[PDB]
Amino acid sequence: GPLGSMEDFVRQCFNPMIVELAEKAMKEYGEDPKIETNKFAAICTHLEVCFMYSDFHFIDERGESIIVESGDPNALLKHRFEIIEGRDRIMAWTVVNSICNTTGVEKPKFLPDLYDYKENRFIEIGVTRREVHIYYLEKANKIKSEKTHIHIFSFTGEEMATKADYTLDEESRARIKTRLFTIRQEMASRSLWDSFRQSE
Ligand SMILES: CN1C(=O)c2c(O)c(=O)ccn2N2[C@H]1CC[C@@]1(CC(F)F)CCc3ccccc3[C@@H]21
Ligand SMILES: [Mn+2]
Ligand SMILES: [Mn+2]
């Protein structure tokens, strides 16, 4: 069919909060969302994954990790994950430093994406249009002996995580994989997927 705009796709597919945080991040790093449109889409996707990973996961009044999908958590429930991504660098490092003071976890060399209050570890989220093992190994060769746990998602449903430790249940991860599949198929419908896949 016709070739669409990636700009139009991003503004229709992602919630306005995600699009706004992505625009803010690209301005911070000197990237124009109007030009680097495939990168804008990749930033929105990765943000959405980070939010989806955290969504519905709480620590309850007994210190137990649970799942509440109702939308209406009582105010004794703590989010299981701190979301680091989506914050300007100052606030992102302020949150990191605050977690490290609270938990005694080592301060990470590189800004991570999430912190898991159950597993007591930072998380690096990856989303790739390439083979997941290739992107896992690129992240691994960057993080080295840093204690940040790596979790990679592809658009084809493959995953790879540090030491085969996937953190979340299968249904939580399937929600993320279903969303990535939806994004890929809607990109393909608008003849965007080929440029997007090859720009990685
Ligand atoms: C600080 N950054 C990250 O936290 C990060 C990731 O967590 C990641 O998994 C992969 C790439 N990352 N990077 C870097 C640098 C800054 C960008 C965003 C900026 F252009 F607005 C560069 C492009 C880009 C594309 C997709 C997703 C995220 C990012 C960001
Ligand atoms: Mn990040
Ligand atoms: Mn990441």
Side-chain angles (χ1 to χ4, degrees), residues 46 50 85 111-113 123-127 135 139 151:
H46 170 266
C50 289
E85 195 51 279
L111 250 192
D113 291 315
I123 303 164
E124 174 63 28
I125 299 292
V127 181
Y135 196 47
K139 292 281 205 197
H151 194 142

PDB file of all heavy atoms in Angstrom, residues 46 50 85 111-113 123-127 135 139 151, ligand 3:
ATOM      1  N   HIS A  46      11.230   1.374  23.149  1.00  0.00           N
ATOM      2  CA  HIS A  46      12.042   0.989  24.322  1.00  0.00           C
ATOM      3  C   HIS A  46      11.437   1.564  25.593  1.00  0.00           C
ATOM      4  O   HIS A  46      11.372   0.859  26.634  1.00  0.00           O
ATOM      5  CB  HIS A  46      13.481   1.414  24.130  1.00  0.00           C
ATOM      6  CG  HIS A  46      14.353   1.308  25.327  1.00  0.00           C
ATOM      7  ND1 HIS A  46      14.557   2.374  26.154  1.00  0.00           N
ATOM      8  CD2 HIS A  46      15.204   0.299  25.724  1.00  0.00           C
ATOM      9  CE1 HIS A  46      15.475   1.974  27.100  1.00  0.00           C
ATOM     10  NE2 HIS A  46      15.860   0.730  26.838  1.00  0.00           N
ATOM     11  N   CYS A  50       9.904  -0.547  28.843  1.00  0.00           N
ATOM     12  CA  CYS A  50      10.329  -0.291  30.225  1.00  0.00           C
ATOM     13  C   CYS A  50       9.079  -0.102  31.082  1.00  0.00           C
ATOM     14  O   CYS A  50       8.986  -0.668  32.201  1.00  0.00           O
ATOM     15  CB  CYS A  50      11.222   0.948  30.346  1.00  0.00           C
ATOM     16  SG  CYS A  50      12.860   0.712  29.660  1.00  0.00           S
ATOM     17  N   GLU A  85      14.635   5.108  33.236  1.00  0.00           N
ATOM     18  CA  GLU A  85      14.439   5.583  31.867  1.00  0.00           C
ATOM     19  C   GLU A  85      13.307   6.599  31.871  1.00  0.00           C
ATOM     20  O   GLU A  85      12.377   6.573  32.687  1.00  0.00           O
ATOM     21  CB  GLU A  85      14.271   4.364  30.930  1.00  0.00           C
ATOM     22  CG  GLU A  85      14.385   4.578  29.486  1.00  0.00           C
ATOM     23  CD  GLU A  85      15.579   5.312  29.042  1.00  0.00           C
ATOM     24  OE1 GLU A  85      15.519   6.555  29.137  1.00  0.00           O
ATOM     25  OE2 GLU A  85      16.498   4.650  28.530  1.00  0.00           O
ATOM     26  N   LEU A 111      23.987   4.467  33.123  1.00  0.00           N
ATOM     27  CA  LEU A 111      22.583   4.687  33.555  1.00  0.00           C
ATOM     28  C   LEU A 111      21.767   3.476  33.109  1.00  0.00           C
ATOM     29  O   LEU A 111      21.777   3.153  31.934  1.00  0.00           O
ATOM     30  CB  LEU A 111      21.937   5.900  32.913  1.00  0.00           C
ATOM     31  CG  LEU A 111      21.627   7.126  33.748  1.00  0.00           C
ATOM     32  CD1 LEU A 111      20.723   8.035  32.926  1.00  0.00           C
ATOM     33  CD2 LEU A 111      21.063   6.848  35.126  1.00  0.00           C
ATOM     34  N   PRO A 112      21.110   2.762  34.048  1.00  0.00           N
ATOM     35  CA  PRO A 112      20.253   1.637  33.708  1.00  0.00           C
ATOM     36  C   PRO A 112      18.829   2.086  33.375  1.00  0.00           C
ATOM     37  O   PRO A 112      18.531   3.280  33.388  1.00  0.00           O
ATOM     38  CB  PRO A 112      20.316   0.786  34.968  1.00  0.00           C
ATOM     39  CG  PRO A 112      20.378   1.782  36.067  1.00  0.00           C
ATOM     40  CD  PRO A 112      21.181   2.962  35.503  1.00  0.00           C
ATOM     41  N   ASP A 113      17.939   1.106  33.178  1.00  0.00           N
ATOM     42  CA  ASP A 113      16.545   1.396  32.811  1.00  0.00           C
ATOM     43  C   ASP A 113      15.572   1.305  33.974  1.00  0.00           C
ATOM     44  O   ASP A 113      14.601   2.074  34.062  1.00  0.00           O
ATOM     45  CB  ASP A 113      16.120   0.513  31.670  1.00  0.00           C
ATOM     46  CG  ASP A 113      16.812   0.848  30.381  1.00  0.00           C
ATOM     47  OD1 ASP A 113      16.870   2.073  30.103  1.00  0.00           O
ATOM     48  OD2 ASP A 113      17.286  -0.038  29.647  1.00  0.00           O
ATOM     49  N   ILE A 123      18.369  -3.076  36.154  1.00  0.00           N
ATOM     50  CA  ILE A 123      18.054  -3.796  34.902  1.00  0.00           C
ATOM     51  C   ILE A 123      18.364  -2.888  33.698  1.00  0.00           C
ATOM     52  O   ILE A 123      17.924  -1.699  33.721  1.00  0.00           O
ATOM     53  CB  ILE A 123      16.601  -4.328  34.838  1.00  0.00           C
ATOM     54  CG1 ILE A 123      16.268  -5.260  36.011  1.00  0.00           C
ATOM     55  CG2 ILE A 123      16.316  -4.991  33.504  1.00  0.00           C
ATOM     56  CD1 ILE A 123      14.759  -5.445  36.153  1.00  0.00           C
ATOM     57  N   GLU A 124      19.024  -3.475  32.712  1.00  0.00           N
ATOM     58  CA  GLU A 124      19.151  -2.869  31.387  1.00  0.00           C
ATOM     59  C   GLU A 124      18.184  -3.615  30.460  1.00  0.00           C
ATOM     60  O   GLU A 124      18.364  -4.806  30.196  1.00  0.00           O
ATOM     61  CB  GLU A 124      20.609  -2.939  30.913  1.00  0.00           C
ATOM     62  CG  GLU A 124      20.770  -2.447  29.473  1.00  0.00           C
ATOM     63  CD  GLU A 124      20.401  -0.988  29.254  1.00  0.00           C
ATOM     64  OE1 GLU A 124      20.523  -0.246  30.208  1.00  0.00           O
ATOM     65  OE2 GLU A 124      19.784  -0.725  28.204  1.00  0.00           O
ATOM     66  N   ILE A 125      17.244  -2.866  29.910  1.00  0.00           N
ATOM     67  CA  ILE A 125      16.297  -3.352  28.922  1.00  0.00           C
ATOM     68  C   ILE A 125      16.823  -3.093  27.529  1.00  0.00           C
ATOM     69  O   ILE A 125      17.196  -1.925  27.238  1.00  0.00           O
ATOM     70  CB  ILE A 125      14.922  -2.690  29.100  1.00  0.00           C
ATOM     71  CG1 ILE A 125      14.293  -2.976  30.471  1.00  0.00           C
ATOM     72  CG2 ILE A 125      13.997  -2.989  27.926  1.00  0.00           C
ATOM     73  CD1 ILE A 125      13.880  -4.410  30.680  1.00  0.00           C
ATOM     74  N   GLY A 126      16.835  -4.104  26.702  1.00  0.00           N
ATOM     75  CA  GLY A 126      17.128  -3.939  25.277  1.00  0.00           C
ATOM     76  C   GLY A 126      15.989  -4.371  24.417  1.00  0.00           C
ATOM     77  O   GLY A 126      15.266  -5.316  24.728  1.00  0.00           O
ATOM     78  N   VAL A 127      15.776  -3.644  23.322  1.00  0.00           N
ATOM     79  CA  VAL A 127      14.830  -4.003  22.273  1.00  0.00           C
ATOM     80  C   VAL A 127      15.563  -3.966  20.952  1.00  0.00           C
ATOM     81  O   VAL A 127      16.215  -2.964  20.677  1.00  0.00           O
ATOM     82  CB  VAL A 127      13.610  -3.080  22.253  1.00  0.00           C
ATOM     83  CG1 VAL A 127      12.637  -3.494  21.169  1.00  0.00           C
ATOM     84  CG2 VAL A 127      12.911  -2.976  23.580  1.00  0.00           C
ATOM     85  N   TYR A 135      22.532  -8.785  20.051  1.00  0.00           N
ATOM     86  CA  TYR A 135      22.322  -7.567  20.875  1.00  0.00           C
ATOM     87  C   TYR A 135      22.614  -7.839  22.348  1.00  0.00           C
ATOM     88  O   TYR A 135      23.247  -7.000  22.989  1.00  0.00           O
ATOM     89  CB  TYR A 135      20.948  -6.972  20.677  1.00  0.00           C
ATOM     90  CG  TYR A 135      20.785  -5.566  21.175  1.00  0.00           C
ATOM     91  CD1 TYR A 135      21.670  -4.551  20.913  1.00  0.00           C
ATOM     92  CD2 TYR A 135      19.751  -5.234  21.958  1.00  0.00           C
ATOM     93  CE1 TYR A 135      21.454  -3.251  21.349  1.00  0.00           C
ATOM     94  CE2 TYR A 135      19.490  -3.946  22.398  1.00  0.00           C
ATOM     95  CZ  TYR A 135      20.329  -2.927  22.071  1.00  0.00           C
ATOM     96  OH  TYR A 135      20.041  -1.675  22.486  1.00  0.00           O
ATOM     97  N   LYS A 139      25.399  -5.729  24.553  1.00  0.00           N
ATOM     98  CA  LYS A 139      25.130  -5.134  25.894  1.00  0.00           C
ATOM     99  C   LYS A 139      26.077  -5.779  26.926  1.00  0.00           C
ATOM    100  O   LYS A 139      26.575  -5.073  27.780  1.00  0.00           O
ATOM    101  CB  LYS A 139      23.688  -5.366  26.360  1.00  0.00           C
ATOM    102  CG  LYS A 139      22.630  -4.625  25.568  1.00  0.00           C
ATOM    103  CD  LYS A 139      22.485  -3.221  25.920  1.00  0.00           C
ATOM    104  CE  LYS A 139      21.096  -2.655  25.614  1.00  0.00           C
ATOM    105  NZ  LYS A 139      21.190  -1.204  25.629  1.00  0.00           N
ATOM    106  N   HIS A 151      18.124  -7.671  30.023  1.00  0.00           N
ATOM    107  CA  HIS A 151      16.985  -8.411  29.474  1.00  0.00           C
ATOM    108  C   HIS A 151      16.665  -7.818  28.096  1.00  0.00           C
ATOM    109  O   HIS A 151      16.289  -6.630  28.017  1.00  0.00           O
ATOM    110  CB  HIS A 151      15.783  -8.315  30.410  1.00  0.00           C
ATOM    111  CG  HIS A 151      14.687  -9.281  30.119  1.00  0.00           C
ATOM    112  ND1 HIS A 151      14.005  -9.875  31.146  1.00  0.00           N
ATOM    113  CD2 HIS A 151      14.198  -9.753  28.959  1.00  0.00           C
ATOM    114  CE1 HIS A 151      13.103 -10.684  30.601  1.00  0.00           C
ATOM    115  NE2 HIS A 151      13.214 -10.692  29.244  1.00  0.00           N
TER     116      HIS A 151
HETATM  117 MN    MN B   3      17.861   0.066  27.604  1.00  0.00          MN
END
